[PDB]
Amino acid sequence: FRKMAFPSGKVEGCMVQVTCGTTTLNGLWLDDVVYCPRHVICTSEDILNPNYEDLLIRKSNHNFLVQAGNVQLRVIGHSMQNCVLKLKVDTANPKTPKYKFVRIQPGQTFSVLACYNGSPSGVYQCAMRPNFTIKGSFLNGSCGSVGFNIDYDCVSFCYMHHMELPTGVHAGTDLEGNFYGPFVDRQTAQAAGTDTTITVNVLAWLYAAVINGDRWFLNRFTTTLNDFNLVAMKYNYEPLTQDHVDILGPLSAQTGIAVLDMCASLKELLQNGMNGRTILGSALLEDEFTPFDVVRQCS
Amino acid sequence: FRKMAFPSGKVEGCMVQVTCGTTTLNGLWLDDVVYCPRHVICTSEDILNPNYEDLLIRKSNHNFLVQAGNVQLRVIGHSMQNCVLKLKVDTANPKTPKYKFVRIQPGQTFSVLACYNGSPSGVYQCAMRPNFTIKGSFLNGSCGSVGFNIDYDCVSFCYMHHMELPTGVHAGTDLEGNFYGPFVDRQTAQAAGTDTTITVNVLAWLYAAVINGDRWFLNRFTTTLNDFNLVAMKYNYEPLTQDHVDILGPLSAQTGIAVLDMCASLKELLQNGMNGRTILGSALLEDEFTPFDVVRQCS
Ligand SMILES: *[C@@H](O)[C@H](C[C@@H]1CCNC1=O)NC(=O)[C@H](CC(C)C)NC(=O)OCc1ccccc1
Ligand SMILES: *[C@H](O)[C@H](C[C@@H]1CCNC1=O)NC(=O)[C@H](CC(C)C)NC(=O)OCc1ccccc1
Numbered sequence: 120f121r122k123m124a125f126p127s128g129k130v131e132g133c134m135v136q137v138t139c140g141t142t143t144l145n146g147l148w149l150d151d152v153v154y155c156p157r158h159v160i161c162t163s164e165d166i167l168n169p170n171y172e173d174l175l176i177r178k179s180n181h182n183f184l185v186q187a188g189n190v191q192l193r194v195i196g197h198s199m200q201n202c203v204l205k206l207k208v209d210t211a212n213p214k215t216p217k218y219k220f221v222r223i224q225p226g227q228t229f230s231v232l233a234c235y236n237g238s239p240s241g242v243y244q245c246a247m248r249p250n251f252t253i254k255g256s257f258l259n260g261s262c263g264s265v266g267f268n269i270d271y272d273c274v275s276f277c278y279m280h281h282m283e284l285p286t287g288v289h290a291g292t293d294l295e296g297n298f299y300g301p302f303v304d305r306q307t308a309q310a311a312g313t314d315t316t317i318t319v320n321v322l323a324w325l326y327a328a329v330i331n332g333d334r335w336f337l338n339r340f341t342t343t344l345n346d347f348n349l350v351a352m353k354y355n356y357e358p359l360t361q362d363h364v365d366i367l368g369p370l371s372a373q374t375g376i377a378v379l380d381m382c383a384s385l386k387e388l389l390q391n392g393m394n395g396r397t398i399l400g401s402a403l404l405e406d407e408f409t410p411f412d413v414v415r416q417c418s
Numbered sequence: 419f420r421k422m423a424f425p426s427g428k429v430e431g432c433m434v435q436v437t438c439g440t441t442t443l444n445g446l447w448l449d450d451v452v453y454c455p456r457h458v459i460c461t462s463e464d465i466l467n468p469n470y471e472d473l474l475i476r477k478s479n480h481n482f483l484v485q486a487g488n489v490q491l492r493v494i495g496h497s498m499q500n501c502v503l504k505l506k507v508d509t510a511n512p513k514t515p516k517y518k519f520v521r522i523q524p525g526q527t528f529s530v531l532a533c534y535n536g537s538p539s540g541v542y543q544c545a546m547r548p549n550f551t552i553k554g555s556f557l558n559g560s561c562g563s564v565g566f567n568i569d570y571d572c573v574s575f576c577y578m579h580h581m582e583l584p585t586g587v588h589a590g591t592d593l594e595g596n597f598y599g600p601f602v603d604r605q606t607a608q609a610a611g612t613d614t615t616i617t618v619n620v621l622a623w624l625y626a627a628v629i630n631g632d633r634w635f636l637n638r639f640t641t642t643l644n645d646f647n648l649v650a651m652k653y654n655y656e657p658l659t660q661d662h663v664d665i666l667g668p669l670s671a672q673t674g675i676a677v678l679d680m681c682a683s684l685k686e687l688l689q690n691g692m693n694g695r696t697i698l699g700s701a702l703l704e705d706e707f708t709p710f711d712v713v714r715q716c717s
């Protein structure tokens with residue numbers, strides 16, 4: 120199995136650059152609105168504890184330089200929604216895809232189009248960790264890069280990049296500017312809470328192994344969801360939700376292995392280890408493939 | 419630090435679907451020519467042992483059904499270059515990027531845009547293995563998907579997909595239709611030569627681990643180039659040349675670790691194992707990042 124990003128072309132056509140002062144970051148141009156991180160209006164003196172409301176009252180439309188490549192888009196209105204700035208421009212983007220703004224859950228994956236100065240640089244898959252960070256690859260100038268899923272030509276934007284944490288992982292908002300996790304857009308020392316293993320994704324990976332004929336770990340036990348969740352927490356695994364059980368439905372049907380039976384299999388792996396055996400050619404259990412990713416790659 | 423693919427938009431606009439008889443696969447539309455694998459002309463019986471020139475002379479232009487999105491393109495001519503068919507169409511692709519056709523070297527990387535029925539499905543990074551296979555993610559109908567690199571807006575196409583070996587690795591051609599490796603577009607179970615590990619890429623990846631603040635594998639020892647190559651060859655690694663040492667220059671200069679010092683690190687890792695530890699989250703030595711890949715991502 121491979122981490123497979125979505126084709127990025129529909130998002131590439133939406134990337135612009137936004138400069139305020141000497142700060143340039145990326146923005147997302149959909150119809151006649153450009154979305155970008157609000158900290159673009161900050162100066163080096165403002166970043167430690169910015170007063171965003173007061174900083175925005177001092178700004179005008181003519182303070183914002185929005186460029187598609189080197190072509191300026193005239194700004195005709197501006198507002199702030201949570202942690203994102205919305206700049207109304209005088210041109211509707213003709214490359215706007217069908218799209219939706221979505222807030223994802225921990226465990227869900229998405230493609231990131233890493234951008235600099237409005238120019239796309241690369242694309243890769245990320246998983247939202249239970250502590251609401253992602254292991255991205257972002258350098259200076261990457262803020263405003265977005266993460267997305269594509270379903271039948273509709274782009275669901277779920278992530279806009281804002282910051283790096285001391286441990287090297289990353290944090291950001293949805294496209295309504297609401298941070299994932301307990302982070303704030305200040306230049307302050309923030310620490311990711313203790314992370315956990317994404318149980319629903321590990322189960323998806325065990326289903327993927329079974330589909331491919333690797334099923335030594337299928338055992339003779341079952342469990343209740345509550346009994347499993349209590350054991351999972353003792354191994355730093357996430358508890359399963361009702362939604363998790365349901366999204367494992369298609370893989371359970373495809374293999375004929377009930378979800379709670381697979382849970383009992385993983386429970387044995389957690390209490391006894393792998394004993395030098397592998398699963399899908401790996402000694403480690405993979406937790407960044409969702410049940411959709413497994414189906415997507417096997418279809 | 420992640421495996422990062424190039425943004426795929428410039429290639430997406432080039433993908434079309436090619437149908438001949440009962441066979442459907444993808445084609446690459448540049449200017450007024452569509453490139454696709456020639457085994458599209460084969461039927462279920464032809465494929466075991468096809469005489470392609472004989473099969474192709476018996477085809478007409480109207481035997482080829484080319485679809486770009488919903489619109490039909492009309493084939494007004496056709497020729498064959500090695501294992502690739504060149505279908506001349508009456509419309510120029512308006513989305514043709516600046517492009518070149520290149521034959522890539524073993525150890526080099528490229529991005530694959532996996533397509534089905536002419537529609538892009540996913541994007542991911544691959545390396546050309548020393549045995550001229552690629553470890554990809556390809557299903558039925560993925561033939562004609564292409565691999566590429568992008569440099570300053572110029573797409574360099576290096577790979578077109580043709581088949582999957584029984585081991586699950588993949589084989590294809592350059593855009594001139596010549597296979598990478600000893601493979602042939604016939605429906606037979608084919609084996610590759612023994613694969614080896616791309617040593618220069620393992621070293622680049624160890625340097626990436628240090629740029630990202632990881633050092634558990636470093637040691638105080640050093641080695642000569644020839645002594646390293648003796649151990650490398652013993653573990654089925656490719657030889658390291660002086661040109662490789664030079665190409666690793668920037669990564670050594672950035673981290674202040676001499677190339678031959680890092681070779682002594684890898685020698686130790688090869689002779690001791692990783693001992694249950696991980697490097698950049700991996701439990702195995704990674705050889706699909708080139709020195710350029712590491713540089714581009716890290717700076
Ligand atoms: C967006 O331009 C930038 C993304 C950082 C740059 C280095 N890697 C990243 O992901 N965001 C910030 O620099 C962000 C801005 C406000 C939230 C204050 N601040 C931040 O991430 O603090 C940590 C940091 C700053 C500069 C370099 C490295 C880490
Ligand atoms: C192209 O659409 C298709 C590629 C994929 C790769 C994954 N599974 C696929 O089907 N190519 C073929 O089907 C190819 C056709 C030949 C005429 C080149 N055949 C092939 O991959 O067969 C491999 C094979 C043949 C006999 C025994 C075992 C394997």
